[PDB]
Amino acid sequence: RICYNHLGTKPPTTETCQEDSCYKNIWTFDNIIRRGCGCFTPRGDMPGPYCCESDKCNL
**Rounded Cα–Cα distance for residues 57 and 22 (Å):** 7
CATH of residue 54's domain is 2.10.60.10
List Cβ neighbours of 13 (8 Å cut-off, separation of 6 or more): 4, 5, 6
Count other C-beta atoms under 10 Å from residue 54's C-beta: 12
Range of the domain at 54: 1-59
Residue 58 has a CB neighbour count (10 Å cut-off) of 24
Domain count across the chain = 1
Q: What is the 3-state secondary structure (H, E, C) of the chain?
A: CEEECCECCCCCCEEECCCCCEEEECCCCCCCCEECCCCCCCCCCCCCCEEECCCCCCC
